Design a protein around this ligand. Structure first.
Ligand code: A1I54
Length: 128
């Protein structure tokens, strides 16, 4: 399913081209503008370990998830991934540990060397 499809078909959006962050656009957004570093950004997301064994959702917060892009308030893969997205876009990301929680992990939620998958919808972004 979705994680495997990203492995097979997703675009490598890393600078290093190390396949650390792979993307598929699932639904196209509007306009040509993507957010600049420092923009305040608004998303809905569904995430899980690639194993599929934990599953987490903004909808469980019954509210959008808000953060400032490229300020390291989220894992590297989101700073990288959301920067590529247009308002209204929905994308799938598959993320090696180097762009997420690394060999240290983040217990108890995230084991060492975890690959993560997300479906993200970019709702809006606004200048600081
Ligand atoms: C590692 O701790 C969590 C990870 C995630 C959800 C959590 O609670 C809802 C977590 O604990 C408390 C909040 C800390 O926030 C971490 C950081 C901001 O999160 C991130 O960068 C990324 C991307 C933004 C949404 C949250 N996300 C996560 O890694 C989730 C993961 C939970 C389990 C499946 C994969 C997503």
């Amino acid at each position: 399913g979705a994680p495997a499809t990203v492995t097979e078909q997703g675009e490598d959006i890393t600078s290093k081209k190390d396949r650390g962050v792979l993307k598929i656009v699932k639904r196209v957004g509007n306009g040509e503008e993507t957010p600049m570093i420092g923009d305040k950004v608004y998303v809905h997301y569904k995430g899980k370990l690639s194993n599929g064994k934990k599953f987490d959702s903004s909808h469980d917060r019954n509210e959008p998830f808000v953060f400032s892009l490229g300020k390291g308030q989220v894992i590297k893969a989101w700073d990288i991934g959301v920067a590529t997205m247009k308002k209204g876009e929905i994308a799938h990301l598959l993320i090696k540990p180097e762009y997420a929680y690394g060999s240290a992990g983040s217990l108890p939620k995230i084991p060492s060397n975890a690959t993560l998958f997300f479906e993200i919808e970019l709702l809006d972004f606004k200048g600081e």
